[model samples]
Target: QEPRTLPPSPNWYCARCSDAVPGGLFGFAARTSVFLVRVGPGAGESPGTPPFRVIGELVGHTERVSGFTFSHHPGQYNLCATSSDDGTVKIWDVETKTVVTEHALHQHTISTLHWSPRVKDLIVSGDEKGVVFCYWFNRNDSQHLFIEPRTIFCLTCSPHHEDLVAIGYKDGIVVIIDISKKGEVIHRLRGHDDEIHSIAWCPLPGECYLATGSKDQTIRIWSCSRGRGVMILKLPFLKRRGGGIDPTVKERLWLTLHWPSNQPTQLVSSCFGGELLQWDLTQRRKYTLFSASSEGQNHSRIVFNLCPLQTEDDKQLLLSTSMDRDVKCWDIATLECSWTLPSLGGFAYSLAFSSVDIGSLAIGVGDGMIRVWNTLSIKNNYDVKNFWQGVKSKVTALCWHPTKEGCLAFGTDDGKVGLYDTYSNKPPQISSTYHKKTVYTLAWGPPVPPMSSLALYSCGGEGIVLQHNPWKLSGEAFDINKLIRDTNSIKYKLPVHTEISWKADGKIMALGNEDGSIEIFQIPNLKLICTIQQHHKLVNTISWHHEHGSQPELSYLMASGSNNAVIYVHNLKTVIESSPESPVTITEPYRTLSGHTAKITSVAWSPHHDGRLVSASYDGTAQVWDALREEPLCNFRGHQGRLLCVAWSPLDPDCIYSGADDFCVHKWLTSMQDHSRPPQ
Candidate 1:
């Protein structure tokens, strides 16, 4: 059965805004930003928990948080390093509870950060500038590290050699560097068709193997020893369960939303692309030996980060949290769930595994709660073993107790520091005063020679720092799935094929994606209008006569860019004439816009003009095109990062709006002569 719940507050807050931003229940609107629940520590983690919990909510940048890192230590001054929507790197001192160190890394958003294990003074951060910085933290100085790059997106440290590092960029370029040698980039690891988002060194020491995740929605495992991709793991979405159930849950009770059966069989390289997979690496050192799924819970939704773990008995577990509102722990050996932790609201962005064991597992949940679960090793065990959980706010990131057992440290979204003792069975000791905005990342260094490792770091929204020692909390995991499985939820019987029809003039709705093939339906119950299987990839955007003030017949013009960079033009009039079994025909991509030199990010038809269209590219360029012609009228190469989105101004034909990899929006006018255009 499907679950039921009431709507939330009307005056709900959105990212970077205070005024009530109008939004729907399950749909995002108007370039809205989402803040993930950083920590949650309760059975349900919904609302109405007590004891004033100490959940960490990471908010370090003025805009949005892109990436984060956690210290591997157990309760030292655990710290987190964060990259932001803004082009800056701010270090949060978890003990001091403030942003003690801030560095300007790029003119655009900082995409990734790395701290070296061999050299404490040395760190590396990358930005959309396609460059990276190797920093040196000084005891009494203003500048901390060095910066250099073109545009980088992800980073990782070599587990085998502490001084070795790797970075990935928007241009699908990967680089490996040797930090011990004054941070010189040693090699370029390239073999991806799209931008890369994640990279990890192999588990075996000196293995010279690395795993990379990319926007192409594929995880390619590479062997640096051989300098080639060893294996590729691709995840495909399962078809929805047939519509045997109901649509509305709480409102339309007694329905069931069925889960897909044919799940992917590889590592989930991209959660937002709807691939949740687990790769079994025990048997085949090369190739995807085994694969499974964790439901589509976070699939098709943005997953900020992942933390891996295993029990003392050698049972592997992967904690995957996403903007999809849940923390899923997958057992690698069993290919089944060890536990599923639900979030309070929005999606759970980041996840951190405590230095503690699985039976003594601890998680930072959304809604600002940190929960410690002492799970039972016995299979099929679904009982509460032990738990010390509470957090009053949102949690962005967390670190395990650095040295002592049963101790933990976490940072929150409200600019605060929380320390908990597992043995105490109480809310963590929270330092309410810390960073101003969301805390993005945290790290804890190991014991430094004489002292027991006891330092932690956190960086986030307000860019503050606070240090703290670990307090203990008593907790263990239980079989909550047995207790919490909703017995009364109205499951929606989703259509085997759901089709939508949209048009500039609602007079005759233009059909959109239908039958997983390029097909369109007419509005008002959507009658089959046309089908064009000429293109192989999925079609995302379709504009008709701009729908606002153009001629209705002018709707004959439409442009779509899919998984491929080739843009296809559809002339409805021509499609209607050269009749086949279907109406629409894929016109020869007469004008293949090429400035992007990468995937075409978005394509928009001008609502004001019949032939005018606007397109954005991953190559960081926006251009105005005359679809009927063989070339773009003009290319606007202004974004400092990848140009991801674009929209034409409804008020003025020449005015335009574009958003890019830098995380900020820009307004562009067709004519540079406009007074609003800044002097070049």
Candidate 2:
């Protein structure tokens, strides 16, 4: 059975102030997919808009794809070919990444291949045993000759004359063979002391000039027509002319070389270890420029989460954190920017606000550091504060302490949480590393007993909810899948859990995930209370309602958002009470709030307003729902990209905040939300 996709209707709680912001469940975790993305507008082309998004990706390769060769001059539509190392190679239609045709005719793993810029399918590949062949795919024919005994390492088809190809090998030999003329005629040349790793054809397609790099830490520029090495350079020569390479690149066994398409004499090379240098065949030493990189202002990538900067003057502003390296601030309404923070440390991640409202804002980011800021302390209406720092890897997750002030949990990509006191200078308490990678969610709650101190509860990418008590320096980290499997009749299921929530009282917790079940539990120890399994697809996220406004009240409803458009608003009344006769499983839900018709990412409830909920998703809109009804009160689709997160203001009954890949934080005014009429 599947969760229902409820019809869309209007209610109340949908009005916002300044509109707009700039723009998943990890089910596919393997190397079978090859994604095609549009990076930007192209040269010699009309003005184009680049969403910088993955348009499509092919998924037919059974093994890790080693070669990602695309048409050198891919048509406006684009095309691709992937080698699975296995004999298989599939021609891909890039506009929509699906297999055009598949082929496999090699005795062993194919090391490399290239697409003829002029011919989309006229491809050439070299295999382990020096087996070299050409395929004019549609003609459905393969050509090979000589098949030398030495294994081939790298190869390139002549940029101008598709008739000739270069094959480099482990024996430090280079073969410039002409196949279009008679049979296979080989022009063998020997130079480097070690195996030749990469080859680049000169930009002058009319002449056979080559720049080849090898495992010997040297590069040679030669001419096939002249038939001799012209300009050779080594590691010491590169650094003396340009600058010293990185320590990582200092001793790599091999290198990758390429020449700028337009700049013929200018060349570049990268060691297998992520370091590169540009060379000027004309001049050097003082003029050589560049280094290892950065990105643009609109976040170089996804803006996973953020917080709203609400000033007393009420200027529409937002605090944004992203997968992008730099931290940026933009005026919500005017779309203005006053400052851009250097994000040299790492790409940003989870950001949070203080409930007690010292107006404290913090983020767990890359560079292995935690950055905290005080929004209200600034006179210019900006922020500055020393945030807690981290455990050496990119900080992956974060959570605030419930009862304590100036305390938070800063976690790393390495799966360990560094519990810190921003108010103290001492090192943060370390949470044990019982995780896989990426600490996805962190929460502050109590240990089983009333006398025991509250501790940290974490849910990572896997099936476990680790209950870590730092007081004793360790705690229980059991996989909840076994407990959940006992509640389901279907015994065979993969363990992929995400998104967990603890009831405000810390007595009960709710779990949502890939197994398509909403598992509820008693927190003292995770004793399963309820398992709602109607959602056929994996659940992506969930938010438990702390329905009580500043004036306290009770709530039995929890919202679970999954792969489908509609979100399941479950009523836990049957499991909340101590009724032994009640069944442990729930087949139905209180309501299914649907509209986006896309995968949901984040679902949150308003702490100030009763039964008011907000949902964010891949559909690029955040809809506001009145939990008492099936239809949302309003829809906000101003984001330029998909919304990853949505937050509520505890102080303002009329404010909402959202963040997405678009690289900006959006502050919305919910004035009409207080009083609005619904449709029939």
Candidate 3:
């Protein structure tokens, strides 16, 4: 084992030969090899971790294995076909665990492959280069390449008919190809609005029924004989009807479709949102919802943010926002999934928890709407009497008024800020004259000592920072360019600030800019107090230790994550009393967390725990670390896609929520103890 060379998907397949037999074969992809294993004969009869024993291994491909399937050979189901990004296809014998024959005609990576049910020696391979090759293991026989206009995404030979096979294309076209007739295109049909990902042929012997799932949110049933689409089943759209689409949703173009050999009337389809739907085809369009049998219990798209909703009762509700357009809830205290509400205003780009109200949540939607939810009473579907659409373009950042009731502030892609009062129906107050580009982060400044009101602060991508009050038509724009001009260590870098943070006592403020330099400024005067030379790339998030608000030692610890994939905890205690004429200097970080291999996206310090911290990265992993320690303690492994954000519970010191590109929000414990490790 060379330190775990592996991928997360297209890994495993089990042969459905017999349930009572001992060596019911299973194959899984390793680095570039396929490992064979089996369960005991009585393993299925009762189930307490079925006994698994490795039988053999087949290693041939030079690249990672992309896909593989078991042979449908009648009596001896001993054959398997595997495709690789090495542009080769190999036939293997399950009994011997050795390659029987191989073909390497494809110039590009093969996208999909399938074995013939009747003709045991025949199989087909498709590639993204808009080509297909059908090969018969009896080596001397070969046919000319069958080419298509669009990329071939998926293919399957009909279980009942040896000659007929269905092929789905990148342009949403489905066709019936007769492999026996030298790859003849028998039928070409098009009804889907987007690309088709999954195609399947029903196993029954009657008129052949072909099913295709597409990115258009609908599935079409076609008859091979009729050569046209006969029935269309509309997939339940989870996004709100008037909401806009997300680029992440468009990237998820494929769903899987299957047909049962034993039951002729049932056809199963697994849609994008981790749901499995089975249709009893007694009628022309009979599709009923069967509460997900193999839901896998996670989002099917990228997740952006996690909000741990603070409730009035002792109950802890963790809300997850994802590109799947669903808001899922979790009870971390009880370790149970609570409720999932689908269809929202739009992509939840940013969310902020209101400290003034219990169970009050605000989300900035990409559709220029702000959705406020009374999470306690949101069990009903009509929780959106509190939604507003007064903002322009995409709402990028959100912040709640710290002291004012129902006062919410948000920044937009148009470089403007809007203030809204949830208690009134009047139009929101919009500010148009502060910045020229998108505001990536918004923060309401904590009031100065002896001051009762707070000021709203914003950082825009145009490298500008503005300090102003709500409903104000004018504000003071700081000359940050001049503040950094005195430094000799500065290089040519984008000055756009990515994240801004304020000290707990409201006496100091810090902003991280594109050059990876964290500049600290004094409040009320906005004086440049310190310049910390740390990261080399862009900074994404900055978090300050919040426990010791009045204490100088622990409170001076500021943790920041940057594009260099390193988290730096800087202690600004030396600069606490420095002046603008000669600010306190720091050249090294107090501590660095460097376990991630991808850019750091979010770093959150626990409000209740003095030294606890939660961080997320694009490496598809969330790690729990301590500011006072060097190594990460707990690593989360739930997300399948890159993680974008995380939230540490305000009340539950040990509770943390992480959101990822897998369209899932997972709640993990920050209080895990040292456990046993894997034996090497």
Candidate 4:
């Protein structure tokens, strides 16, 4: 049966402000209205002044907008197009602030919307399904010109060539097509090994410079005139420059690319980490013009788009939009934020209160970016600044440092383990790789000797579990020999470490293996205590409950979930006290909880609830269970796809978060009065 609840359409995805052109500022959220902000002299008039106010709102779109662009055609400055995830595209008249025409173009998320600079009323859009559609609004006609298996991340029409349009695929392939010739492929450029996020065309008089940025952390400037030969020059800023470049070079994703119309050799780019760089093409070097550190405590968040604008006074300003729902105006010369506006209201995939600071929270988004919000006061607005981000990998695990303040450990599908310090503007202080596959779990152990170092335990899909001192691995200069220095290694044996959990006091560790075996290990020493094989299939998730002042029964408790749809809770104290020589395998479970109809995907124990646990399954529902009892306490039924992951907030036990295959993360409040009712 289909889910009963309607999905939320959030408008905080993208926003754009018109240049010195006469059109009003445009901001789109997941709402029916296209928000308009006017820039001009207000009631208190001047020669060229402030007080940018909400002039009016244009209502038309029925869903959340993904991309929007202003028409650059000479007299068509008032025309714009907005594309939505609901598969619809609307051409709006900026002068009238109303929709001129709208069409249902795709069956999936519309990834990008582009207006042809050479043709009036010409719009092109690409979707999550890799179908690019060309539309002529003057005649209300549309044509599907290209189809590929990968998702289309970005598309842009060449400013100089009337027939040429550039399309960037999810597979890092950039292809130029002649739209006038029925999408004939012109030049195919291939060098990146990850997803492409941004692409731009240079309008310089002499050379054709096509810049493409990808998740591989590299931006390639291709000379299409020479037919995609070895890229003119790979941005050395992104490369591993021995020891002098920025620490974030290889970790952050390049998000948006912009080239000044007047200064064609100068390119400005933004990263997922919110760092802005200006490249001098003539010298083949890049400089950090703006970065998170420049803002002090109020740095920018994950930058989605960067637009170069000129004020009425002829001053050059850069407008940057981010996931934090803020559009900031930056002075290009000084790299200072001249103005800021807040609130986009987009949902995040992962959120957790920092263990180091009670007033801080970390939010992880779909694009593998993390923003740290400082919530010092209930009445004060938070500063959602850039924290850490991975170029192309999905964040699979995020955990705050147990003993360190503002320190976060995150794992990615690309097998990277990153340690981020929220207090610092720099990227992950420590980025190490040990696994050849996706990292499934991360946990921090007790602080070791030297006092400044902490043990970081990570498990991956490759059946390997590694332990390291993050502080020893990241210094002014990271030595490869130090990582294998032998003194910094700890071990655990498992067929496949699919999931891991740690005891509250950080004394005991538990690993859930792919073969349905649950292994218990001694902390610090990494000695195997015991192994229990209870489930018949692969174990998918596990959670540990430590006793707090309020939840006395939760201490030393462990829960393991498997594909068999059964959950088992173990009392680690009892297992450890029954000391069988060396190690022994037990086939029986301490307590078996069963209710889900399909395979279990994830499980979490509530921090506030003594006997409560949550489990997500392929059955499309996340059920809250009383571990002491076999029956479920409540079932969250709003998700439309299989529930792949679930997390119970460590600070708020009544709050539960679930990640689904539907590309959504839902928050369920167990504190609600009617949460115990059966699914209708």
lDDT of 3 by residue, 1-680 (tens): 00001111223111111111113544544335564544334213233322333345567788766556667565656788788878788888877778888888787767777777778788787877868887887664545457576777777778787787788877787878887687788888879867676776776776678888777878788876777778887765443222233333244434555555555676655454434445667765555433332243455553322323333333444443344544444444442445544443333456566778754667665655576755344233224333444675777778888778899888888888778888887768776565788877788785432223576778888877666556463443443444444342355753677678887778888889888888887865556778787988888888888755345478888999988777889987767854556566577999988788888878877776666677888887777776687767777755555776677644456666555543333445645524211111
Badly placed stretches (over 4 Å) of model 2 are 1-30, 41-53, 73-77, 118-121, 181-185, 205-207, 237-254, 271-273, 283-289, 292-428, 432-442, 446-454, 458-500, 505-543, 546-554, 559-680
Candidate 4 accuracy as lDDT: 0.65
Superposed by TM-score, candidate 2 places the C-alpha of residue 505 at a distance from the truth, in angstroms, of: 5.8
The superposed Cα distance between candidate 2 and the true structure at residue 45, in angstroms, equals 16
| Predicted model with the maximum lDDT | 4
Backbone clash pairs for candidate 3 read: 301-663, 302-661, 302-663, 303-663
**For every candidate, C-alpha RMSD to the true structure in Å:** 27.9, 13.7, 11.3, 12.5
Please give the distance, in angstroms, between residue 7's alpha carbon in candidate 4 and its true position after superposition.
Answer: 12
lDDT, candidate 4, 128-231, per-residue tens: 78788999999878888774577888888888787788888878888898887888888888787777778888776455778887767677888777876434
What are the TM-scores, per candidate, against the unseen true structure? 0.38, 0.56, 0.56, 0.53
- Which model is ahead, 2 or 4, in terms of lDDT? 4
Clashing pairs in 4: 10-30, 11-29, 11-30, 325-344, 547-555
Which of 3 and 4 is ahead in lDDT?
Answer: 4
